[PDB]
Structure 1
Amino acid sequence: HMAVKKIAIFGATGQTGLTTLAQAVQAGYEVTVLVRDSSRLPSEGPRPAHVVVGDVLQAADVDKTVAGQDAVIVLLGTRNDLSPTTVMSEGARNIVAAMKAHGVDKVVACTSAFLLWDPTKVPPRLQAVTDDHIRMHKVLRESGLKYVAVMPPHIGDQPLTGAYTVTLDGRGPSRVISKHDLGHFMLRCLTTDEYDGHSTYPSHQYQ
């Protein structure tokens, strides 16, 4: 028996999402993904249990993805596009509404460690994306759901270790986390309540 077994992953086709999905399938989760029509999961990769094709900006599609889950992981982003956007915050608004309507409480959602910085220290090139992370975090904090705010520093390509530091409610001692370790942490947050209502900063020294 698995207490948390059915999960929705938003952003499963992305850099962190692909390894989070692979790790979740290996760990025995029954994974539902929401994918945009033109960007499905790769053919040879791990297969989720359920695929909804649609858009996080459509409440109906988010409702179809959240229905019947035990928990939600959010790895939405805009790839290498740094333009002004609201896809993460509006997506989170739809996810919150769906979770409430469907009785799902646990949401583990990735924004960024810039939400623990002096705002004057965010690089201007990243300020438009960070502004939407700030909007998204406010939506999730005000929802009343069991929300783990994951606020990573630079996401790298180093290995899965499971040995990273998790700093609560502040910046940690390294400035990198591998995408594989970030995905491992998102899944770890499904199985404990200790991070609920906190900000978390995962980081590691790869050596």
Structure 2
Amino acid sequence: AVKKIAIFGATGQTGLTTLAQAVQAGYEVTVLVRDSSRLPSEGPRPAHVVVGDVLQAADVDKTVAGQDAVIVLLGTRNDLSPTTVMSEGARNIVAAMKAHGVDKVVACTSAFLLWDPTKVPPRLQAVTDDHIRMHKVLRESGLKYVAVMPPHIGDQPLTGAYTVTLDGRGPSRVISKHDLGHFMLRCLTTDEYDGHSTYPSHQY
């Protein structure tokens, strides 16, 4: 099966809980981080740490080296400014995966990619524009791409009881970060989501 995985964005809101969950599942986890201060120093911890930036292809190449699959949870935290970090980072990730024969990438964009584009809140259009750019990168890559498109990410506890809607909008507008990370790892265990959009949501 999949044993060795790389996570990008592992120090983020969803990355931290995905990292913990993956380590407890038994995965051998490699992370690319800009600052190891934002990784936990005890408890569930990754087996390999690369220090660097997803914009530097050499750093991405040594993170993807030797992996079986890739989880992408890159984002901008509280910065809503125009950016190309996620799409450019995604071009780096795709090339390193092809250079190392990795096929499986599970990447998080957002449910707004399933919305009427005129209906996106103006404050979120700039970030959304780069999710679109990133989704196009991965769609065009030809890899085995699970497009995870969550609605609002909350901080409710882990339930593992969430719904997953394929290629459409789901009946709830929230997923907890813990259930979102749980589902990113579920995508590693099956190929039933490959080439589909997935919307995870639950009522808390």
Give the alignment's TM-score, normalised by structure 1: 0.97
- CA contact under 8 A between 2:36 and 2:51: conserved in structure 1? no
- CA contact under 8 A between 1:105 and 1:145: conserved in structure 2? yes
How far does the alpha carbon of each residue in 1:45-104 deviate from its partner, in whole angstroms, 9 at most, with x for none? 421000000000000000000000000000000101000000000000000000001000
How far does the alpha carbon of each residue in 1:134-184 deviate from its partner, in whole angstroms, 9 at most, with x for none? 000000000000000000000001111111110000000000000000000
CA distance in 1: counterparts of 2:25 and 2:36, whole angstroms: 28
Counterparts in 2 of 1:1-207, with a 5 A limit?
A: 3-37=1-35, 39-206=37-204
- CA contact under 8 A between 1:7 and 1:31: conserved in structure 2? yes
- CA contact under 8 A between 1:114 and 1:122: conserved in structure 2? yes
Which structure 1 residue ranges, 5 or more long, are not aligned? none
CA distance in 2: counterparts of 1:78 and 1:65, whole angstroms: 20
Deviation at 1:37, TM superposition (A): 3.5
- CA contact under 8 A between 1:13 and 1:39: conserved in structure 2? no
How many residue pairs match? The answer is 204
- CA contact under 8 A between 1:10 and 1:74: conserved in structure 2? yes
SS at match of 1:186: helix
Deviates more, 1:136-145 or 1:33-42: 33-42
Across the aligned residues of Structure 1 and Structure 2, the Cα RMSD in angstroms comes to 0.9
